[PDB]
């Protein structure tokens, strides 16, 4: 039920891809992920299926057939303290890219040209793990944004999350047209004594 999370007027960026926000409320889903991460302000535009740079190709990679939504709101107190918060690291350069939906917690030194880098730093070897400059005294583009990306997938397994949107109310005793879950017909509706299992 994503209808109550759209008109709340509490998110700075509530966009989707492929599936419309007003259509995924009455549609089943096999499994929904929860990719939560805190980035800067200029990196929000790079979180899109089909982008490149130094963040989407080295940290979080989005699939080409991504049919989900991107939830992002403004914040400066739940992830940035006074004096500068340098607790969120990120990878800037690496020897290879990252496939979509893949995590990496290793720590290696990037190799630029010669001087193979394996446990030794200095010349031709730089530390890729930097740090964001989340400070409340900076501008607007340097403000942190807690982006929560939701992934939608469909497999052959029966989906446990399901349910259509609200419909017209009930009437009884009158001759009426009716439609129950797509069962279109005409008749009189009443209570019944019937002992349905």
């Amino acid at each position: 039920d994503y209808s109550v999370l759209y008109n709340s007027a509490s998110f700075s960026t509530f966009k989707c891809y492929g599936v419309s926000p007003t259509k995924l409320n009455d549609l089943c889903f096999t499994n929904v992920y929860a990719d939560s991460f805190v980035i800067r302000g200029d990196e929000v535009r790079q979180i899109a299926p089909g982008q490149t740079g130094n963040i989407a190709d080295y940290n979080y990679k989005l699939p080409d057939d991504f049919t989900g939504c991107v939830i992002a709101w403004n914040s400066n107190n739940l992830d940035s303290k006074v004096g500068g918060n340098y607790n969120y690291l990120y990878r800037l350069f690496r020897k290879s890219n990252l496939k979509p939906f893949e995590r990496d917690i290793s720590t290696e030194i990037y190799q630029a040209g010669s001087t193979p880098c394996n446990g030794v730093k200095g010349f031709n070897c730089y530390f890729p793990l930097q740090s964001y400059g989340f400070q409340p005294t900076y501008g607007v583009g340097y403000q942190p944004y807690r982006v929560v990306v939701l992934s939608f997938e469909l497999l052959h397994a029966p989906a446990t999350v399901c349910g259509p949107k609200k419909s017209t109310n009930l009437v009884k005793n009158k001759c009426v047209n009716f439609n129950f879950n797509g069962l279109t017909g005409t008749g009189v509706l009443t209570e019944s004594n019937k002992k349905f299992l």
């Epitope: 630029a112 040209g113 010669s114 193979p116 200095g122 031709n124």
Partner: antibody, heavy 107, light 113 residues
Framework: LVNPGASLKMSCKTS????????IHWVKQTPGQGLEWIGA????????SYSQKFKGKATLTTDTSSSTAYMQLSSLTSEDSAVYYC??????????WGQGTSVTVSS | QIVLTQSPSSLAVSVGEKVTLSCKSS????????????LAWYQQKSGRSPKLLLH???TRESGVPDRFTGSGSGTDFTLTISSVKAEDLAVYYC?????????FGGGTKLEIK
């Protein structure tokens, strides 16, 4: 033509190849002597690498939009005059080691 | 700051004659982690850009004849040329690839007898 103590800037652009290299190199060779390495440059964070012999006389600046490496030479001397060659370094060589420009130093 | 010593000063080679030139490094240029020797061989024809002939001393350059073959063990590095031609004559140099600062210890003119 640069007088002793003048500042000289040399720029070279790779031709047929678009970036795709993690190092750039500068070499000074006087005629009748072997090539001597000067400095190495990195495309992202500046390498700022200088040889101990050339340290304090050479400055390395790279501009992505320009697509050409920049080398600044200071305190030029008669010994300093030599042919300097723009070069690079990827896996091995990929038409990255370019040609050289002769330097003459006199008042 | 490992200086590299390369000898001899001059190489006299006839056309179609195999020749061996050796460059010696003060410290071993083999990285312990990969157990691979690091060195570069360069050709320097007159009025020409410095050109890499052999890399790592184990891999030939693309579009390079099999006549140029180099084998290096530990400190000693050896490059062997065969079927030498007038176009082939050039100054030959050994460049350390093991660690900064880079040192060009290359140094061998090639002449035809």
């Amino acid at each position: 033509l640069v007088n002793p103590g003048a500042s000289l800037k040399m720029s070279c652009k790779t031709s047929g190849y678009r970036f795709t290299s993690y190092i750039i190199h500068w070499v000074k060779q006087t005629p009748g002597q072997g090539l001597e390495w000067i400095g190495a440059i990195f495309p992202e964070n500046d390498d700022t690498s200088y040889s101990q012999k050339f340290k304090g006389k050479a400055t390395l600046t790279t501009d992505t939009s320009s697509s050409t490496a920049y080398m600044q030479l200071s305190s030029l001397t008669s010994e300093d005059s030599a042919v300097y060659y723009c070069a690079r370094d990827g896996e091995n060589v990929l038409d990255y080691w370019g040609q050289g420009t002769s330097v003459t130093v006199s008042s | 700051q490992i200086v590299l010593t390369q000898s001899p000063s001059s190489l006299a080679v006839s056309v179609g004659e195999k020749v061996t030139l050796s460059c010696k490094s003060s410290q071993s240029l083999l990285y312990s982690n990969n157990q691979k020797n690091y060195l570069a061989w360069y050709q320097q024809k007159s009025g020409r850009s410095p050109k890499l002939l052999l890399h790592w001393t184990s891999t030939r350059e693309s579009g390079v004849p099999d006549r140029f073959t180099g084998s290096g063990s530990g400190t000693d590095f050896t490059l062997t040329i065969s079927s030498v031609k007038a176009e082939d004559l050039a100054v030959y140099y050994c460049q350390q690839y093991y660690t900064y600062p880079w040192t060009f210890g290359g140094g061998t003119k090639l002449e035809i007898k």
